[PDB]
Amino acid sequence: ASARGYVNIKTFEQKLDGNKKIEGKEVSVAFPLYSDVHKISGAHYQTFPSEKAAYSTVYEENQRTEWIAANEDLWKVTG
């Protein structure tokens, strides 16, 4: 782990259109990274801090670009 704590982010499922949905998602982002870049505002979400990642999907400090893509992905609509 990052040993600096994590920001635990939950996206709540919402519908956008006929057979178009933004799936709920649960991810953890290393604090040093979350605090560096994020696009979560108006997103229908909830978040809390923790000493260790709360979720199975984690974005570590050295995965900056995976997280940037992941933020955009929290707004993505699918089948």
């Binding site: 505002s41 979400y45 909830q46 978040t47």
Partner: peptide, 13 residues
């Protein structure tokens, strides 16, 4: 981190 956004501030839910 929670209280600041409690009950829908900034898109929270």
């Amino acid at each position: 981190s929670i209280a600041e956004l409690q009950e829908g501030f900034n898109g929270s839910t």
